[PDB]
Amino acid sequence: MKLNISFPATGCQKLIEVDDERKLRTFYEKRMATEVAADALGEEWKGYVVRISGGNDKQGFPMKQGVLTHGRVRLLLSKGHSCYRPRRTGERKRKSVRGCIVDANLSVLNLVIVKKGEKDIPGLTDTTVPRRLGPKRASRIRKLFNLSKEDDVRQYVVRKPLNKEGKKPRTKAPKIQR
Amino acid sequence: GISRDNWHKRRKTGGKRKPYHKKRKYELGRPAANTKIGPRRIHTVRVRGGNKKYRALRLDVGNFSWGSECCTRKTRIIDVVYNASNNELVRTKTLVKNCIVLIDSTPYRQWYESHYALPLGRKKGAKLTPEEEEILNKKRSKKIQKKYDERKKNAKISSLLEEQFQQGKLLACIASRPGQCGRADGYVLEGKELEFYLRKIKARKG
Amino acid sequence: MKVELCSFSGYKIYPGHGRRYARTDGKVFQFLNAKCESAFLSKRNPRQINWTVLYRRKHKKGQTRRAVKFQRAITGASLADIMAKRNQKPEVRKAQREQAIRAAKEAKKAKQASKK
RNA sequence: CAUAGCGACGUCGCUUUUUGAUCCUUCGAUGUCGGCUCUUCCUAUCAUUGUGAAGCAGAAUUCACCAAGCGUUGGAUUGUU
RNA sequence: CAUGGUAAUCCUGCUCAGUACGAGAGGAACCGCAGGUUCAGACAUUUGGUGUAUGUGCUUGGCUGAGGAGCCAAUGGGGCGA
RNA sequence: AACUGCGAAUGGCUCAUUAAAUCAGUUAUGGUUCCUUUGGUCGCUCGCCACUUGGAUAACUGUGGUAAUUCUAGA
RNA sequence: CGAUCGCACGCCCCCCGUGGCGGCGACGACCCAUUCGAACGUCUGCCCUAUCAACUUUCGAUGGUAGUCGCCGUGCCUACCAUGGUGACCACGGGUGACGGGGAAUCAGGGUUCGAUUCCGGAGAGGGAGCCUGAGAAACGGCUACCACAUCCAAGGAAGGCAGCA
RNA sequence: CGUCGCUACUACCGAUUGGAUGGUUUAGUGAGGCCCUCGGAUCGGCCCCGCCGGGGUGCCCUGGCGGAGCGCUG
Numbered sequence: 001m002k003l004n005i006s007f008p009a010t011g012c013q014k015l016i017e018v019d020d021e022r023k024l025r026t027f028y029e030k031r032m033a034t035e036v037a038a039d040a041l042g043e044e045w046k047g048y049v050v051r052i053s054g055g056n057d058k059q060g061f062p063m064k065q066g067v068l069t070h071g072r073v074r075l076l077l078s079k080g081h082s083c084y085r086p087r088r089t090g091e092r093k094r095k096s097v098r099g100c101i102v103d104a105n106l107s108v109l110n111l112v113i114v115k116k117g118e119k120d121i122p123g124l125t126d127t128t129v130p131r132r133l134g135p136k137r138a139s140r141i142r143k144l145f146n147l148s149k150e151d152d153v154r155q156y157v158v159r160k161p162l163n164k165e166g167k168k169p170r171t172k173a174p175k176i177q178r
Numbered sequence: 179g180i181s182r183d184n185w186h187k188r189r190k191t192g193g194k195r196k197p198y199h200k201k202r203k204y205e206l207g208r209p210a211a212n213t214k215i216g217p218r219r220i221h222t223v224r225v226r227g228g229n230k231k232y233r234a235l236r237l238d239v240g241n242f243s244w245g246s247e248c249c250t251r252k253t254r255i256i257d258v259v260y261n262a263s264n265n266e267l268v269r270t271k272t273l274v275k276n277c278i279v280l281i282d283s284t285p286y287r288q289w290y291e292s293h294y295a296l297p298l299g300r301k302k303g304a305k306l307t308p309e310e311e312e313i314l315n316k317k318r319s320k321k322i323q324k325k326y327d328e329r330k331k332n333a334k335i336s337s338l339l340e341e342q343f344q345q346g347k348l349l350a351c352i353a354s355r356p357g358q359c360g361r362a363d364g365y366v367l368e369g370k371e372l373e374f375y376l377r378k379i380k381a382r383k384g
Numbered sequence: 385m386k387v388e389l390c391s392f393s394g395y396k397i398y399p400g401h402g403r404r405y406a407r408t409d410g411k412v413f414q415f416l417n418a419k420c421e422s423a424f425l426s427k428r429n430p431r432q433i434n435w436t437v438l439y440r441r442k443h444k445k446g447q448t449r450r451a452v453k454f455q456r457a458i459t460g461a462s463l464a465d466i467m468a469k470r471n472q473k474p475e476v477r478k479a480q481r482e483q484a485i486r487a488a489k490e491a492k493k494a495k496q497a498s499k500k
Numbered sequence: 501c502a503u504a505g506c507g508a509c510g511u512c513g514c515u516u517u518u519u520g521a522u523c524c525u526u527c528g529a530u531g532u533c534g535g536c537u538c539u540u541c542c543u544a545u546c547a548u549u550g551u552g553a554a555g556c557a558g559a560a561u562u563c564a565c566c567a568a569g570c571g572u573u574g575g576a577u578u579g580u581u
Numbered sequence: 582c583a584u585g586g587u588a589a590u591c592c593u594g595c596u597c598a599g600u601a602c603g604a605g606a607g608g609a610a611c612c613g614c615a616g617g618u619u620c621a622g623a624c625a626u627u628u629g630g631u632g633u634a635u636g637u638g639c640u641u642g643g644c645u646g647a648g649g650a651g652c653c654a655a656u657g658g659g660g661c662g663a
Numbered sequence: 664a665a666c667u668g669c670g671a672a673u674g675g676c677u678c679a680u681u682a683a684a685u686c687a688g689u690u691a692u693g694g695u696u697c698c699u700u701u702g703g704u705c706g707c708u709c710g711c712c713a714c715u716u717g718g719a720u721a722a723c724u725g726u727g728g729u730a731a732u733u734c735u736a737g738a
Numbered sequence: 739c740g741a742u743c744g745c746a747c748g749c750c751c752c753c754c755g756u757g758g759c760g761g762c763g764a765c766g767a768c769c770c771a772u773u774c775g776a777a778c779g780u781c782u783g784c785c786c787u788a789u790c791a792a793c794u795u796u797c798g799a800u801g802g803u804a805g806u807c808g809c810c811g812u813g814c815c816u817a818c819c820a821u822g823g824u825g826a827c828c829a830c831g832g833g834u835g836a837c838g839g840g841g842a843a844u845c846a847g848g849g850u851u852c853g854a855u856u857c858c859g860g861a862g863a864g865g866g867a868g869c870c871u872g873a874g875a876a877a878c879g880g881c882u883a884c885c886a887c888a889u890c891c892a893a894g895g896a897a898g899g900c901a902g903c904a
Numbered sequence: 905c906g907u908c909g910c911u912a913c914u915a916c917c918g919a920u921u922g923g924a925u926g927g928u929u930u931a932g933u934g935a936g937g938c939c940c941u942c943g944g945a946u947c948g949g950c951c952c953c954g955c956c957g958g959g960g961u962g963c964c965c966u967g968g969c970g971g972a973g974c975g976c977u978g
């Protein structure tokens with residue numbers, strides 16, 4: 001049962017291959033969006049509290065929050081529920097979804113670290129990938145650079161420097177709104 | 179679903195009519211609102227043309243007009259006392275268009291002292307003195323007292339309404355349609371209609 | 385030691401215990417004893433029988449605020465860069481606004497000269 | 501090709517599970533058919549064990565020997581045997 | 582232990598083997614394995630039956646003034662039941 | 664590319680159903696709704712952001728599941 | 739009771755010197771009117787059949803009263819009442835190898851047959867049934883369920899609707 | 905002209921509580937949608953307030969960890 005491990009404060013999600021029942025028993029019979037101390041995955045995962053954020057069934061069916069069962073059910077899914085995007089407006093389609101309780105019968109199990117452990121997981125907590133593009137709204141950059149009122153707002157926007165080999169150098173700035 | 183078509187009915191001669199099409203949307207129906215009495219709960223349904231209808235599922239207040247006195251106050255509905263259509267609507271306390279209900283007389287009373295300067299519904303007085311003492315005397319001038327005692331000659335209320343004010347509850351007939359407008363507006367029963375409904379309620383019980 | 389099954393009452397059914405019932409529609413049920421089997425066959429609802437597990441969990445028998453935000457670097461502006469930008473409070477920003485205002489002032493004087 | 505398997509014309513026997521023949525016992529009474537149930541016995545063996553023979557290539561079948569240990573059923577119609 | 586009784590029986594499938602034999606069509610057997618039929622001797626862990634433990638609920642008519650607790654109706658009836 | 668808006672209820676096909684039903688002419692909606700167009704109306708209301716307020720989500724980066732789909736999940 | 743988007747850009751400067759004014763549009767709107775309509779209504783009109791003469795009426799049949807619901811008028815539905823309503827001037831039932839009409843064939847006059855078929859109106863998308871969105875659908879080159887067919891599967895599931903053009 | 909005898913064809917009656925395929929329905933079961941009454945897996949705001957902080961001057965303008973107020977709420 002693979003584990004898709006992701007740390008939001010740095011990004012750098014990674015997939016973990018484990019096959020030990022004893023290691024995975026700490027997750028069993030836990031609902032989604034619950035924080036469980038992931039200290040059963042050896043010494044390296046000690047001191048880690050992780051949140052169960054979802055997964056997929058043995059047949060690739062994603063799990064839906066609030067189903068409150070183990071196994072698969074069929075639900076009439078409307079716009080904006082989960083596990084479904086409407087092909088046309090107002091369309092609702094019946095689909096199969098996995099329950100929120102996790103057991104051995106899964107392919108993956110999406111996990112999100114809530115609080116940091118005592119050491120650094122290799123390839124996970126390091127090499128912090130930045131957020132690509134900064135705020136576009138004027139208020140959202142006022143909050144980010146702590147502006148009071150109208151102090152060089154135009155030039156305090158984030159400029160995106162992009163380079164390619166055949167490209168002649170140039171910077172890119174967004175059209176700031178509101 | 180619930181259809182309001184005329185083709186499922188028999189012909190005037192009694193012959194069986196055969197439908198030439200399956201059920202159409204514009205000839206639909208919807209479940210009854212069944213407006214009870216309780217905390218305000220109104221549901222919005224979409225209707226033909228994209229307009230809006232209000233399903234008053236539960237109501238507690240309604241705008242009832244005195245009529246004779248041209249007094250229109252937002253008061254509280256207590257219970258349903260009589261319904262011409264069905265007795266079960268009285269038993270289940272369901273608000274429909276023509277059922278008559280008991281409503282509080284407090285705002286109408288307050289308007290009556292504030293306009294006519296007469297006790298109404300009181301038994302002996304001297305019970306709300308820091309307000310009624312002020313509103314009886316008012317130490318007002320000659321012209322204001324001239325207006326007030328000019329308004330005394332027409333300050334007669336029917337003994338039936340006087341009894342209802344003594345009891346503290348007026349009985350009034352709804353005029354709006356809950357489940358269509360989502361409110362319970364109405365008018366205070368008085369005169370011959372009040373006597374007719376009083377005789378109906380008396381003949382029903384006791 | 386085999387696969388453990390659950391009954392009409394939700395109890396564990398050990399190997400060699402109870403019966404198993406396969407319906408025509410393709411559903412297979414297993415019962416712990418003839419009491420549960422007779423209750424199921426008489427179409428009695430387990431949520432209304434006091435000793436079944438479903439009733440116990442229906443009647444609850446026997447059994448805060450968090451909001452944290454982090455600051456991250458942006459492509460083209462590191463954490464050091466954004467800290468340098470956002471920590472210009474001690475009247476440096478006043479210098480920026482006043483110099484921008486006076487620069488726009490000579491710009492507006494040029495506009496007035498070339499306008500009328 | 502008489503005799504693998506049959507056997508005409510004749511002729512010698514065995515059995516008492518057929519029906520007769522007789523009238524010895526029973527007429528101061530031996531309860532008279534069939535079915536059901538249940539046990540045992542016979543072999544003139546349908547099957548099964550071991551065999552011999554064939555017009556026994558195999559398969560199937562037929563004849564015979566030792567042989568009665570074991571088995572020989574469920575029903576429609578009929579009181580039926 | 583004298584003596585007496587005595588009991589086990591038959592079939593099918595797989596393999597041998599589409600093999601031997603046969604022009605072909607067809608088509609075995611010995612050893613081995615897995616099971617059944619009839620019979621016999623038991624036994625109740627499980628499944629089923631019984632059930633007046635007159636065990637525990639439900640319920641009709643009646644009776645103890647009512648509640649509670651009960652009883653009668655040749656086992657009142659019914660569900661589950663050691 | 665995607666979010667949003669609009670269209671997708673027109674067109675095309677066929678004649679099974681349907682015998683005061685459809686339909687044809689006539690008349691009514693003073694018993695109803697109406698996208699769009701066009702034209703009115705939009706300072707009529709006395710009542711520490713307005714030099715412009717808040718949050719999320721697409722598209723996008725990355726990690727995947729299922730044999731499969733115009734399936735989608737986590738970050 | 740507009741926190742929207744483009745186009746050229748101009749005017750006032752006393753108070754001053756950074757602010758206030760301005761045109762052309764686009765988008766937008768509660769409501770009204772108009773347009774496109776749609777929906778239910780009024781009167782008259784349809785082939786054969788009595789070896790179909792009495793139908794409707796508990797479960798609405800005809801009407802009244804009060805409501806419910808519907809976009810609205812109405813038994814559309816509910817409650818309480820009344821006993822009505824339709825028929826030899828053919829009711830009701832059955833058949834149709836019946837979608838209706840504008841029309842087509844035949845042609846003294848009168849008629850008799852045919853109109854699935856390009857225009858108008860209606861109905862349906864395999865048979866039913868139920869809904870989301872939207873002004874407008876009971877939509878099917880939208881969804882859901884059953885029934886009948888039927889596609890792929892790694893057997894755990896998934897996907898269907900040519901009475902559109904070929 | 906009719907019976908009778910032969911050969912064809914066409915219908916008719918006929919035990920068989922005959923047979924088949926449509927259609928309309930009683931009754932029982934009853935998927936699914938819609939509505940109502942509940943329900944509450946989760947997701948947010950306030951009360952943050954264990955603290956460093958604080959400025960018109962312990963009396964916070966709050967710039968964050970953090971417990972969680974174990975409530976009010978949508």
Ligand SMILES: [Mg+2]
Nearest residue numbers: 176177178743
């Ligand atoms: Mg903009």
Ligand SMILES: [Mg+2]
Nearest residue numbers: 522523524525
């Ligand atoms: Mg003699």
Ligand SMILES: [Mg+2]
Nearest residue numbers: 526529530531
């Ligand atoms: Mg004797």
Ligand SMILES: [Mg+2]
Nearest residue numbers: 529530531532
């Ligand atoms: Mg004897």
Ligand SMILES: [Mg+2]
Nearest residue numbers: 543544545567
């Ligand atoms: Mg012998």
Ligand SMILES: [Mg+2]
Nearest residue numbers: 584585586587
């Ligand atoms: Mg011996």
Ligand SMILES: [Mg+2]
Nearest residue numbers: 569570587588
């Ligand atoms: Mg023996």
Ligand SMILES: [Mg+2]
Nearest residue numbers: 640641642643
């Ligand atoms: Mg009793």
Ligand SMILES: [Mg+2]
Nearest residue numbers: 648649650651
């Ligand atoms: Mg008692």
Ligand SMILES: [Mg+2]
Nearest residue numbers: 653654655657
């Ligand atoms: Mg007796």
Ligand SMILES: [Mg+2]
Nearest residue numbers: 631632661662
């Ligand atoms: Mg029993």
Ligand SMILES: [Mg+2]
Nearest residue numbers: 669698872873
């Ligand atoms: Mg629209």
Ligand SMILES: [Mg+2]
Nearest residue numbers: 678679836837
């Ligand atoms: Mg037809």
Ligand SMILES: [Mg+2]
Nearest residue numbers: 837853854855
């Ligand atoms: Mg035509």
Ligand SMILES: [Mg+2]
Nearest residue numbers: 857858859860
């Ligand atoms: Mg047409």
Ligand SMILES: [Mg+2]
Nearest residue numbers: 861862863877
């Ligand atoms: Mg249609």
